[PDB]
Amino acid sequence: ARIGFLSHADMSIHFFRRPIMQALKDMGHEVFAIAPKGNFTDELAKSFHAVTYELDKASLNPLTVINNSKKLSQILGELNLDLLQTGAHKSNVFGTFAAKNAGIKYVINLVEGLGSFYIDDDIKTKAVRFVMESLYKISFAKADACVFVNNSDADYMISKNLIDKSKVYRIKSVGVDTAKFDPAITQAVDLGEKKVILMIARAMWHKGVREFYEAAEILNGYKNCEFVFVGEGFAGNKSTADESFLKGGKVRYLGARNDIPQLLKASYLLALPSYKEGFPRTVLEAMSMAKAVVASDVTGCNEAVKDGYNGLLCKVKDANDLAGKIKILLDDEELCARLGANGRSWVVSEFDEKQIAKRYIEIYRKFIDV
Numbered sequence: 001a002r003i004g005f006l007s008h009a010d011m012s013i014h015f016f017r018r019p020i021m022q023a024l025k026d027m028g029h030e031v032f033a034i035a036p037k038g039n040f041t042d043e044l045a046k047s048f049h050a051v052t053y054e055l056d057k058a059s060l061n062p063l064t065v066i067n068n069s070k071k072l073s074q075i076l077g078e079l080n081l082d083l084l085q086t087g088a089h090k091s092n093v094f095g096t097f098a099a100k101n102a103g104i105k106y107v108i109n110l111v112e113g114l115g116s117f118y119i120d121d122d123i124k125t126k127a128v129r130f131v132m133e134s135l136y137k138i139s140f141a142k143a144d145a146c147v148f149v150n151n152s153d154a155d156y157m158i159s160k161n162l163i164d165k166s167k168v169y170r171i172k173s174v175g176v177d178t179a180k181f182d183p184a185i186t187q188a189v190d191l192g193e194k195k196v197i198l199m200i201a202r203a204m205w206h207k208g209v210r211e212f213y214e215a216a217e218i219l220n221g222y223k224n225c226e227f228v229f230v231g232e233g234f235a236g237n238k239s240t241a242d243e244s245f246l247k248g249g250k251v252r253y254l255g256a257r258n259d260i261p262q263l264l265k266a267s268y269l270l271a272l273p274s275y276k277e278g279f280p281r282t283v284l285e286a287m288s289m290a291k292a293v294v295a296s297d298v299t300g301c302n303e304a305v306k307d308g309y310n311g312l313l314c315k316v317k318d319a320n321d322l323a324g325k326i327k328i329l330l331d332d333e334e335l336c337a338r339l340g341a342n343g344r345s346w347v348v349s350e351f352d353e354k355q356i357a358k359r360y361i362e363i364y365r366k367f368i369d370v
């Protein structure tokens with residue numbers, strides 16, 4: 001009944017793990033939100049027991065990740081947890097090591113996307129990937145189970161003998177609050193009298209930001225459309241667009257926003273031309289708002305979007321194909337509405353957060369009394 005949720009980012013706790021945490025708290029358990037300080041820490045601390053720690057998120061230096069994990073082991077140990085849920089690579093791997101060194105009896109992992117080491121294909125990345133996979137063989141062996149949010153990632157890690165099938169649990173998507181993301185109770189933001197082509201994402205090049213901005217140039221306001229980008233960029237980072245780029249194209253740049261339902265309600269369709277995903281949550285949110293999706297035909301996107309059902313898939317790394325699919329939907333409003341309607345039906349049937357949270361707790365109940 002002391003259950004911790006470890007992430008490298010408070011955003012994953014706040015956006016993704018939250019419904020599991022709330023359901024456990026409503027049951028009377030002590031729930032811990034373990035993540036570096038961020039923009040959601042203060043309010044998380046009101047709902048849950050917020051615990052921060054120092055983390056060099058992207059560093060691969062040996063001593064740094066060691067020193068980080070030893071400090072993390074002490075911070076975890078002081079919480080006297082019964083079970084720890086980790087998510088994503090650093091927490092899954094080094095978090096599991098730290099957790100077991102702290103004497104935490106039960107550890108559940110979570111893979112939601114394989115990430116950048118499976119996009120890049122250079123010799124340096126190929127080697128980091130082999131090391132990560134070798135470490136996963138150890139950390140998965142120490143852990144008690146792993147949840148996967150799509151099928152592709154589970155199939156892959158099984159095919160590489162990283163984890164035994166008996167420890168694999170497939171819970172498709174992290175869920176979305178379909179009662180908050182409900183068009184019937186949402187007031188659209190006023191973005192003018194345009195067909196808004198909306199992309200929501202941290203502005204990583206690996207999210208297809210460049211292709212989105214190029215597609216904007218290609219269509220150039222075709223049929224009264226307006227490309228709109230929601231999310232954060234960063235300066236002096238080779239992996240992300242900076243604000244100069246994000247403000248300098250044929251795209252209305254809104255930065256970070258906390259009114260996503262209202263933005264989706266104002267949109268014509270949502271685009272996600274990502275290079276790789278787990279089960280994209282902005283796609284789930286568009287679906288819940290009955291909005292068609294144009295996504296790249298890549299891992300994750302192509303499980304959350306079935307071409308011709310709730311959206312259209314486009315080739316990855318291809319601004320012309322992205323523009324072409326958006327133009328199809330601008331040219332055919334009935335098709336676009338029909339795709340979004342299917343998205344809403346599907347998300348309500350399969351991806352509401354409350355049932356997904358209950359399925360995580362059923363896994364926890366195999367190990368601890370809940």
Ligand SMILES: CC(=O)N[C@H]1[C@@H](OP(=O)(O)OP(=O)(O)OC[C@H]2O[C@@H](n3ccc(=O)[nH]c3=O)[C@H](O)[C@@H]2O)O[C@H](CO)[C@H](O)[C@@H]1O
Nearest residue numbers: 015112113174230231256257260276277278279280281282
């Ligand atoms: C693998 C990968 O590359 N990404 C995966 C990772 O999420 P990501 O870290 O890529 O997050 P995502 O882009 O799927 O979701 C971002 C979340 O932040 C919200 N938001 C974003 C910008 C903003 O200004 N305001 C705001 O509220 C947005 O509405 C959504 O709820 O894990 C997710 C949950 O399992 C999915 O599996 C993604 O595929």
